[PDB]
């Protein structure tokens, strides 16, 4: 099933260094509203931190539950998460 | 081997009545904006011309052949109440 990870990123000048898709108004995958990680930018914060992976499902951003949010609320929960960002994610297998 | 159509829709309470996928940052293996669904009772289904997998080329005068998904979504949100869609289909 799933593996779970808490990951703390340091915001960089190019942001957190990854791209997300999904949300209740733009399901990335059929019948799933999850926020998925779709890209880890070479040399950005997320890549340099080393622990996030493409297709990781973001469950929580600091204390903001994003299991069932619109896409832009997920985006804004990351925009406004500060400089030290706690990401709670899960991934397959 | 493509067929073209200009289609003009009257925005409804549920929007234009269809959903779209695609974009440069995205389904279907290329960057095209395409219809995935036409909503029963909506604007697009009452007008009768749009079809699933139609590829949206232009929204009014905004060229959506090479845009991100949100720019396309925003090109449609901001297109007014009477919306000229220019599409092409493999038929």
């Amino acid at each position: 099933d799933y593996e779970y990870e808490e990951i703390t990123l340091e915001r960089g000048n190019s942001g957190l260094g990854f791209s997300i898709a999904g949300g209740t108004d733009n399901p990335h995958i059929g019948d799933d509203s999850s926020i998925f990680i779709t890209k880890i930018i070479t040399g950005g914060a997320a890549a340099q931190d080393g622990r996030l992976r493409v297709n990781d499902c973001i469950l929580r951003v600091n204390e903001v539950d994003v299991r069932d949010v619109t896409h832009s609320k997920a985006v804004e929960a990351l925009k406004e998460a500060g400089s030290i960002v706690r990401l709670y994610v899960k991934r397959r297998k | 081997d493509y067929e073209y159509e200009e289609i003009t829709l009257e925005r409804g309470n549920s929007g234009l009545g269809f959903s779209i996928a695609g974009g440069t940052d995205n389904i279907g293996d290329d960057s095209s904006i395409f219809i995935t669904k036409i909503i029963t009772g909506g604007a697009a289904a009452q007008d009768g011309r749009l079809r699933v997998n139609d590829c949206i080329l232009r929204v009014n005068e905004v060229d959506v052949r090479d845009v991100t998904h949100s720019k396309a979504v925003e090109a449609l949100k901001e297109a007014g109440s009477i919306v000229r869609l220019y599409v092409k289909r493999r038929k």
Partner: peptide
């Protein structure tokens, strides 16, 4: 996909 996004509803429009």
């Amino acid at each position: 996909e996004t509803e429009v």
